[PDB]
């Protein structure tokens, strides 16, 4: 069956280039256009352009023309997309898709996309293994149920995923809410972990978040106080 097999994840420094590949099988490569479409995290599909592998002719979208390059190697049935001068807005999944929907009318002479590749993830980042900085989030009762308080730990600017967080060395698990990390424009991650506790415990009970980033061999035990 028709498949488009795409290359794997890349992590690239700002200003660098990345060249991703799309290998066609199950049909004759020169029979159909290859389209490229990218999708930034949580956002919409954005068409970049197409190439026809027979002629080699390209059609670049205005937004991408001249800092990306589409090529193909028909000897190995592979299309390439090269993105230059990478910036944080270029962190995205890059898809290739076959122009297999033949036009039905000369008035709309367009080959639509039918079969999609699985996408190549490109992360623009300073890219080096980096340990987190951990900051306390001091207790507040403003947004919790009556008689309770939320306190937490901010775990900032680490790479790659993941970081783990426990409280009081695991002795505290009720009321813990660790939020999955955000990948920032910087290409570094941040996450937060909050626990909800009795407000009467605050002047008395000690709360420590235990943070572990194994890739950087970093552990932090941060005391969180009123």
């Amino acid at each position: 069956e028709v498949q488009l097999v795409q290359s794997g994840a890349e992590v690239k420094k700002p200003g660098a280039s990345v060249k991703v590949s799309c290998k066609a099988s199950g049909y004759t490569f020169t029979d159909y256009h290859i389209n490229w479409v990218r999708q930034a995290p949580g956002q919409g599909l954005e068409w970049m352009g197409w190439i026809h592998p027979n002629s080699g002719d390209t059609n670049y979208a205005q937004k991408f023309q001249g800092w990306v390059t589409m090529t193909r190697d028909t000897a190995i049935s592979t299309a390439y997309m090269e993105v230059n001068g990478l910036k944080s807005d270029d962190t995205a999944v890059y898809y290739c898709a076959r122009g297999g929907l033949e036009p039905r009318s000369v008035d709309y002479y367009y080959y639509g996309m039918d079969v999609w590749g699985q996408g190549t993830t490109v992360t623009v980042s300073s890219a080096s293994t980096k340990g987190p900085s951990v900051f306390p989030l001091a207790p507040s009762s403003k947004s919790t149920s009556g008689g309770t308080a939320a306190l937490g730990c901010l775990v900032k600017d680490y790479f790659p995923e993941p970081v783990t967080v426990s409280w009081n060395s695991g002795a505290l698990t009720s009321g813990v809410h660790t939020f999955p990390a955000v990948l920032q424009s910087s290409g570094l991650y941040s996450l937060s972990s909050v626990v909800t506790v009795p407000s009467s415990s605050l002047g008395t009970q000690t709360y420590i978040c235990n943070v572990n980033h194994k890739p950087s061999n970093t552990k932090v035990d941060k005391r969180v106080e009123p």
Binding site: E46, L101, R104, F135, P136, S143, K156, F179
Partner: protein
């Protein structure tokens, strides 16, 4: 040329979902529709306005007239949850254009409004010459939210980082949003706000350097 879709549509199981795609004189073009199920590659569900590729359920129907193309899904089932996109080709610019996409939720539980918790920068972070505001959003359904930040009364777009929602053990959703500032910025305004919009209702929390 621009194609407009609603960011989200919610429908009960068994009811009919309608997803619109607006475009000036879109009726003249042939419209194709993609379904992108969570974490899966896009697939074609409707081609040339109203045709179904093989394998696609007969419940999927398309229409195109005047200024609006519409994807219709009858007797919707949970497995239909996905982001849907229309696309056309604009001959005047030789561009392929995708609509902004529609998140379709098939309602498996009643709607649930978000709880919002906002933390100011810690004195420790400020000492490290950084400032991060932390806005934690939980217990909402459907799992779609938008976050806006303000400095005093003015919108702030720089330095904002927001997660996609993630399903909690209670089967509701959580997300988080972060605003990065310089200590000088943080100290020179009277307040900052995190505004969370969910299903047309808004929760706003505010913190002040004082």
């Amino acid at each position: 040329s621009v194609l407009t879709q609603p960011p989200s549509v919610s429908v009960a199981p068994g009811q009919t979902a309608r997803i619109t795609c607006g475009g000036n004189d879109i009726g003249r073009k042939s419209v194709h529709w993609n379904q992108q199920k969570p974490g899966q590659a896009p697939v074609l569900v409707v081609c040339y306005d109203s045709d179904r590729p093989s394998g696609i359920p007969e419940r999927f129907s398309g229409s195109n007239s005047g200024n609006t193309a519409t994807l219709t899904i009858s007797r919707v089932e949970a497995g239909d949850e996905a982001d849907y996109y229309c696309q056309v080709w604009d001959s005047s610019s030789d561009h392929v254009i995708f609509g902004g996409g529609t998140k379709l939720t098939v309602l498996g539980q009643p709607k649930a409004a978000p709880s919002v918790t906002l933390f100011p920068p810690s004195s420790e972070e400020l000492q490290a010459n950084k400032a991060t505001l932390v806005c934690l959003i939980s217990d909402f359904y459907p799992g779609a939210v938008t976050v806006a930040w303000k400095a005093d009364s003015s919108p702030v777009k720089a330095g904002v980082e927001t997660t996609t929602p993630s399903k909690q053990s209670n089967n509701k959703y959580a997300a988080s949003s972060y605003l990065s500032l310089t200590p000088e910025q943080w100290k020179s305004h009277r307040s900052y706000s995190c505004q969370v919009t969910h299903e047309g209702s808004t929760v706003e929390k505010t913190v002040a350097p004082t």
